[PDB]
């Protein structure tokens, strides 16, 4: 075990170290943050341009700029935005806000998707499978922003029809809430209902299909029939002997669903007004600011690789063909 879970960690470290470099050359080539201050009809005097470029660091080749960026990042300094404000002040808050949403969405999505996929593959071609495999198609065929706006419209209709504010769809938390931990927690859940449901739908939709294929592959093998030939019932043999063997492939696809969730979180945060990494990324590419984006891509790579490593730990724990051979 602790020879497959070590060589699988140096690989992640190398991958992240090189990704944080290739996506800084890519950023410093794509972004030209002075393209608007070198194009005004009363073009500013050159000495202004030189001062601004020197202050913004675009005077040395890309390699030196990246070297200084790392030399500062490892020491807890993340540069400044294009308007002077530092990045380290906001980074912790944005990371916390994004992680709160990602964890909930992923957990609920994968659990529901695994259950639905198993149910569909067990009950193949019955009515329940037929309805679920097309609900998954619908959920998988509507983009994230369409789902989010439809949920906002539905929440508004429900609030107007009922007569009281059942649903809230704005901000991580509601303003002006003085109280203990319980009050704030209830308020936080009240807001967390919808944005996380938006990601849970897509995660469950993907994982249902993947789990259904895996369980179909398992049901085509002969250890279920053997297990039933010792006296186990159909359900006991299907859950104890057949489902657990079908759980193994899922632990390899988790790092892909997590990347999908990271992609969809940008939309979920822009539409519902959350203050996290998706909003920050949109604001950073809109104004072409290098340090914000260079931090966000590093965070995204780290979150994908962390999910990958935890999925690999799970896979080692479940599948004995890697613990021993």
């Amino acid at each position: 075990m602790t020879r497959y879970l070590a060589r699988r960690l140096l690989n992640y470290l190398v991958l992240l170290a090189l990704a944080s470099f290739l996506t800084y050359c890519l950023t410093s080539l794509a972004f030209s943050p002075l393209e608007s201050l070198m194009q005004r009809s009363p073009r500013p005097p050159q000495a202004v341009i030189d001062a601004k470029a020197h202050d913004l660091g675009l005077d040395r080749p890309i390699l030196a700029r990246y070297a200084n960026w790392v030399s500062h990042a490892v020491r807890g300094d993340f540069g400044t935005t294009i308007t002077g404000q530092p990045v380290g002040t906001e980074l912790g808050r944005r990371i916390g806000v994004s992680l709160r949403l990602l964890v909930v969405g992923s957990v609920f999505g994968t659990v529901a998707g695994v259950v639905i996929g198993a149910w569909g593959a067990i009950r193949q071609y019955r009515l329940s499978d037929r309805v679920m495999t097309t609900l998954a198609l619908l959920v998988l065929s509507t983009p994230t922003f369409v789902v989010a706006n439809l949920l906002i419209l539905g929440a508004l209709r429900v609030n107007w029809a009922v007569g009281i504010q059942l649903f809230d769809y704005t901000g991580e938390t509601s303003p002006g809430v003085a109280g203990g931990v319980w009050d704030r927690l209830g308020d936080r859940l009240q807001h967390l209902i919808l944005p996380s449901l938006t990601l849970a739908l897509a995660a469950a939709a993907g994982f249902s299909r993947y789990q259904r294929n895996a369980m179909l592959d398992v049901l085509g093998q002969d250890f279920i029939r053997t297990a039933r030939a010792k006296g186990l019932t159909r359900r006991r043999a299907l859950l104890k002997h057949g489902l657990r063997t079908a759980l193994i492939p899922m632990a390899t696809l988790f790092a892909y669903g997590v990347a999908g969730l990271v992609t969809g979180a940008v939309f979920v945060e822009k539409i519902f007004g959350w203050h996290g990494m998706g909003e920050w990324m949109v604001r950073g590419i809109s104004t072409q600011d290098t340090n914000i984006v260079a931090a966000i891509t590093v965070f995204s790579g780290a979150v994908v690789l962390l999910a990958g490593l935890l999925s690999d730990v799970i896979y080692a724990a479940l599948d004995p063909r890697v613990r021993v051979s």
Partner: protein, 273 residues
């Protein structure tokens, strides 16, 4: 060929979806020259109207006819989706084929490069690059970008296929009798991989439409005065609460397109079991 076609023909849902896709494409390109209102005309006397006898699908907040705007969005979005799917399939096929054919440390290096590319979500990288493509009349560059950052997930399947089929018996049998390698490639591998490449393109269609529309929603994709479906949705959600049709019509169309694409893909895949 005949058995496969009549295997698909069986799938009524798949053929219905494929006919719907072709109908939508043809109507998007051939109907606008027949409508009373062009996509650019502004009708300032009928703002935010319901589907009526003059504007057949109503207007948005500016008086623009909604039907013509939706048709132009469909043109742009579907054309981009098809082109990106084709290019991405080509790139994935070539990389996966060479990596799985050389084998050994060439294969190891190429697959490691693919993983390194997959480490960061593709949407993030596309959005990072997009400031350069935007402000350019040609949509060639947008297609090139969406294709060049969307092949890395299917090239692994292509490599698995190439490795599996390189060792299959009839290849070695062709070797053992003097069949020239070029003749092997033109006669024994291409007919046995063409169909699965077609399937891969059929799914990358929907993948690319999703990516491009999501890009246009945030403002990074197609820029005014051109319109894609994502742009129409983004404009519609601004006044979705008062008059919901302006948001629900393009959204519905988009969902329809995606459903059709996905259905066709799945059907075609299951028709090549």
């Amino acid at each position: 060929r005949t058995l496969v076609v009549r295997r698909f023909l069986r799938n009524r849902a798949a053929v219905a979806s494929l006919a719907a896709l072709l109908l939508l494409f043809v109507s998007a390109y051939a109907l606008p020259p027949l409508l009373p209102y062009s996509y650019d005309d502004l009708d300032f006397n009928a703002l935010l109207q319901p589907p009526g006898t003059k504007h057949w699908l109503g207007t948005n907040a500016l008086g623009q006819d909604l039907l013509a705007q939706t048709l132009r969005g469909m043109q742009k979005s579907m054309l981009i989706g098809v082109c990106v799917a084709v290019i991405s399939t080509g790139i994935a096929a070539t990389v996966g084929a060479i990596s799985g054919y050389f084998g050994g440390w060439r294969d190891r290096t190429l697959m490691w490069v693919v993983d390194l590319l997959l480490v960061v979500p593709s949407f993030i990288l596309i959005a990072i690059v997009t400031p350069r493509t935007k402000n350019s009349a040609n949509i060639m560059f947008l297609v090139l970008l969406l294709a060049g950052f969307g092949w890395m997930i299917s090239s692994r399947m292509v490599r698995g296929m190439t490795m599996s089929l390189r060792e299959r018996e009839f290849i070695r049998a062709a070797r053992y009798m003097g069949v020239s390698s070029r003749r092997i490639i033109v006669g024994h591998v291409v007919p046995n991989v063409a169909s699965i490449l077609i399937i891969d393109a059929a799914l990358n269609v929907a993948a690319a439409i999703l990516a491009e529309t999501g890009l246009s929603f945030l403002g990074f994709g197609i820029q005014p005065p051109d319109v894609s479906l994502g742009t129409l949705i983004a404009d519609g959600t601004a006044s979705a609460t008062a008059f919901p049709w302006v948001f629900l019509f393009p959204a519905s169309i988009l969902v329809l397109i995606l459903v059709c694409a996905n259905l066709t893909g799945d059907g075609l895949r299951d028709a090549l079991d």
